[PDB]
């Protein structure tokens with residue numbers, strides 16, 4: 001797609017800290033950009049939509065290539081349309097925003113310049129952030145994560161995409177998502193099938209795969225930390241059901257692992273660690289600091305700080321695994337005790353280390369889940385299982401929770417706030433900000 005300017009595109013600024021092993025931190029200035037799927041897609045020389053409701057224009061978009069030639073992405077009114085605001089080092093995303101039409105949440109990328117994504121090399125480093133999840137009920141997910149996206153959003157590889165990072169192109173994740181309207185400088189109209197329940201969405205013949213590091217998937221009830229390896233490390237197109245993931249009938253379509261090696265302390269048995277109020281180790285009614293460290297072995301360490309008190313990731317015992325480090329032994333034990341082979345099939349932490357050794361783009365999102373109502377995060381899943389099924393219970397939410405239309409109607413003022421991002425060598429991010 002190309003870019004159009006009927007609405008100007010001004011990325012909300014966002015600062016973050018780059019910390020050094022020598023003990024100091026220096027402020028960086030970036031900004032955030034909304035993903036292309038949220039945008040108005042229209043004809044390059046008129047205001048006629050190329051996509052509207054859940055369907056493509058059959059005249060403007062008779063095929064993927066003609067569609068991309070005919071169509072452009074336009075600018076976003078971040079606050080008024082998308083409920084996205086920033087202040088200094090803080091980013092807020094509202095759940096439901098009403099303008100000319102309804103909007104639900106956002107997916108945002110951290111930029112280096114107005115036309116390029118910021119890339120982070122996670123290996124050997126740590127990432128720290130503050131989060132307020134207090135306004136996130138059952139069924140919602142405020143996510144902060146990394147994906148192996150191109151810094152230009154795909155432009156150099158696919159010149160028929162001239163919109164680029166400035167317009168939030170080039171997304172990929174371990175689901176190999178097929179809901180994206182543009183992939184590799186081509187539309188995704190070929191094979192398009194509208195969703196059953198989401199008025200704005202469908203699934204196309206192409207998907208977009210890449211490695212994914214889910215630092216934070218959470219609401220006020222549950223939180224998870226999850227690496228996802230892919231056999232191709234960076235962004236790569238996939239064909240139909242060969243994509244696997246959420247948007248295919250068979251979720252195991254090779255290249256990517258859509259499940260990951262997940263660590264949810266509640267799922268692992270510590271049901272008192274994270275939740276609303278003073279009965280939990282971490283009180284989710286209050287802001288909390290989350291630090292995630294990527295040691296060169298490929299293992300992942302985690303600690304939290306709230307009110308000046310520090311807690312390592314809680315210990316878990318699973319089969320022959322015992323500890324609090326997300327390592328090979330954990331992931332292998334998890335597959336043995338909970339089931340599945342996707343993470344190991346895709347190469348486990350060794351394959352994942354290829355992603356963290358390279359550049360990844362920071363993503364912050366707020367979403368609800370049309371495919372599984374977020375039950376995999378905060379409830380019992382699948383819902384016919386009981387507590388006797390190892391790993392079935394992931395949180396205290398009802399198995400009836402998280403119906404998107406219901407949570408959107410009941411909790412429209414839900415929101416997530418991410419703030420105080422700090423990045424640098426392991427051991428460096430607790431030092432004074434600049």
Ligand SMILES: OC[C@H]1O[C@@H](O[C@H]2[C@H](O)[C@@H](O)[C@H](O[C@H]3[C@H](O)[C@@H](O)[C@H](O[C@H]4[C@H](O)[C@@H](O)[C@H](O[C@H]5[C@H](O)[C@@H](O)[C@H](O[C@H]6[C@H](O)[C@@H](O)[C@H](O[C@H]7[C@H](O)[C@@H](O)[C@H](O[C@H]8[C@H](O)[C@@H](O)[C@H](O[C@H]9[C@H](O)[C@@H](O)[C@H](O)O[C@@H]9CO)O[C@@H]8CO)O[C@@H]7CO)O[C@@H]6CO)O[C@@H]5CO)O[C@@H]4CO)O[C@@H]3CO)O[C@@H]2CO)[C@H](O)[C@@H](O)[C@@H]1O
Nearest residue numbers: 037038040100103104107143175200226259365367368376
């Ligand atoms: O006409 C003329 C006119 O115009 C105007 O303008 C206008 C126009 O017209 C129009 O068009 C427009 O419209 C627009 C609007 O505005 C807006 O609002 C919209 O938006 C929308 C869109 O459309 C769509 O597309 C979207 O969609 C979305 C959805 O909703 C959501 O949901 C999604 O979300 C996502 C997110 O984001 C992310 O973040 C995520 O990610 C994730 C991943 O994927 C994964 O991988 C992970 O997770 C995972 C984990 O890790 C694992 O572990 C798990 O596993 C599990 C499993 O599952 C199970 O099975 C087991 O058992 O267990 C295990 C363990 O646990 O899983 C999980 C899951 O997978 O992580 C991460 C993070 O979280 O994802 C998600 C999903 O996908 O997204 C999407 C997108 O992509 O939405 C939106 C919002 O609503 O749009 C439209 C268009 O279309 O408008 C405009 C304005 O108004 C003008 O103005 C004028 O002037 C004219 O006249």
Ligand SMILES: *[C@@H]1O[C@H](CO)[C@@H](O)[C@H](O)[C@H]1NC(C)=O
Nearest residue numbers: 270271272273281311314315
């Ligand atoms: C949960 O984790 C906290 C922090 O490590 C610990 O103090 C507590 O004993 C754990 N509770 C259970 C039931 O494992």
Ligand SMILES: *[C@@H]1O[C@H](CO)[C@@H](O)[C@H](O)[C@H]1NC(C)=O
Nearest residue numbers: 382383384385386388389392
């Ligand atoms: C839940 O249902 C699935 C089939 O949908 C089945 O494989 C599984 O055995 C069921 N679990 C229980 C505990 O009955």
Ligand SMILES: [Co+2]
Nearest residue numbers: 049052053101
């Ligand atoms: Co309309």
Ligand SMILES: [Co+2]
Nearest residue numbers: 205206238239
């Ligand atoms: Co194709």
Ligand SMILES: [Co+2]
Nearest residue numbers: 295297299325
């Ligand atoms: Co270690």
